[PDB]
Amino acid sequence: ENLWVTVYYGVPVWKEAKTTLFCASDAKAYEKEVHNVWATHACVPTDPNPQEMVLKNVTENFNMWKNDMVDQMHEDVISLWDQSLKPCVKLTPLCVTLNCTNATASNSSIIEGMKNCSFNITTELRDKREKKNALFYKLDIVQLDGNSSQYRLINCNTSVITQACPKVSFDPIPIHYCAPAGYAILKCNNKTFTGTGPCNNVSTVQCTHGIKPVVSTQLLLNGSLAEGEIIIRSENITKNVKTIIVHLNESVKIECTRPNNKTRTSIRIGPGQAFYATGQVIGDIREAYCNINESKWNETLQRVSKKLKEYFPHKNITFQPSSGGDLEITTHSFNCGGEFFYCNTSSLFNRTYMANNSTRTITIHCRIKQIINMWQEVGRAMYAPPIAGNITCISNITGLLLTRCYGKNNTECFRPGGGNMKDNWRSELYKYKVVKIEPLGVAPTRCKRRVV
């Protein structure tokens, strides 16, 4: 009795919903004269501080494998390459027949994996064309059927190629996501949260922490570390269609280097356009390699097997190397120093486990490639201009994109190789969630409005 409606505003309640999220960048955006790296050129807003505000007693549901933020991350990452390759030179005039032979390093020693090609190209005057020459990797070249001296660029019979502008060199600059006014980006602080199910220590923020837009295939490198011990995530660990994102609490250092120099030479394609190819190769014959502290890898694989068999305590666990086929899918990949590696990781995933640091470094030999059919797109390609000087690179492994195979034996199988590239960014945005606030409410109380 004597209860009437009363309307509140500013009620703290929310409901899940998708929205368009800002893109931001650190106020330390770019320092090489701010020559328009995609993060600084597009994600203009500067350093929104994450003023985290814990929530006393909230119990909130999370679901990483179907959240709204990952798709936006993938779309932005794909689209930010198109907005930067558009002005660069097209290599359409270069898709001509090539008369190509073997290359030779110093002392006339044949160099494996290279071929000295010569081709006809139009000069500044459109009536004249001359016979230039440059050196292509064997993986940028497909032999024209029949004669052994005729070749053609691998990609220029399916799609157009565009050289990457050297002035906009790509780098993993961190990216901050901030929900627009009216929304709120929650997140979970439970330091053993398994990626799905409720979290009892939710908190909100203006924006996500700096997220590196790394690109890689099977070692999820330069990531962030878990705060507890090794964690394992999957929508259904049993089902093979789902990538088993293993997340490391112990970074394992990995080095990769290219021990010889490259001669960058400029070939003019026409009015005001330059095409940088690789001339003579300087230095001795080598294959770019990578190093890992064998003690640390032994320990980390022991730990991952220990954690993984808690879900399969009955039987042994066997790791296996990549199956085989296209280098694009069967090899750990990255872009250290502006040149794309492609490493063979068969030697790192052959250890097996049964039921019940500067020493012994492991080495793995890595190919290199220039014409990248970027993972971000199919039906188009890119050309990475050669980089002078030997390139050394150091990074911290912080995860594995395993996946389980159907071995005939009676024990478990896990081999590297993810099924999609979204899993790279789903190892950083597994905490967050985005909700829309509904600050209007109605409740009963002991009041009725005045009559005057």
Binding site: W4, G10, P12, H41, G182, A184
Partner: protein
């Protein structure tokens, strides 16, 4: 002044009613769509209050009696017991009904005021 944004969530309704002012307070096209979304979403909820006579009040008491057909509670012992989330999950079934009652009540008051002052 700033006091966080949503800390009162998860606390009891009675306690959270004193922090209402905290919750009340080039890509180009991508940001412009979000800006227009924010503006229009605020204007919706700031006009829906004007239609009920609560033009500028965070807390507003109005003339529409309660009945048990909607959510039913003692809400004397249960007031300041539930947090706003459970309450929203409870009474969300009947808001679309309450809004019309509030609108008609406000129309009655405005018509009455216009009639009475004709004798002034």
């Amino acid at each position: 002044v700033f006091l966080g944004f949503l800390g009162a969530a998860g606390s009891t309704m009675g306690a959270a009613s004193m922090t209402l002012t905290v919750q009340a307070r080039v890509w180009g096209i991508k940001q412009l769509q979000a800006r227009v979304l924010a503006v229009e979403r605020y204007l919706r909820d700031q006009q829906l209050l004007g239609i009920w006579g609560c033009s500028g009040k965070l807390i507003c008491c109005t003339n529409v009696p309660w009945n048990s057909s909607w959510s039913n509670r003692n809400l004397s012992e249960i007031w300041d017991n539930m947090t706003w989330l459970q309450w929203d999950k409870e009474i969300s079934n009947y808001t679309q009904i309450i809004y019309g009652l509030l609108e008609e009540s406000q129309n009655q008051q405005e018509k009455n005021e216009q009639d009475l002052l004709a004798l002034d």
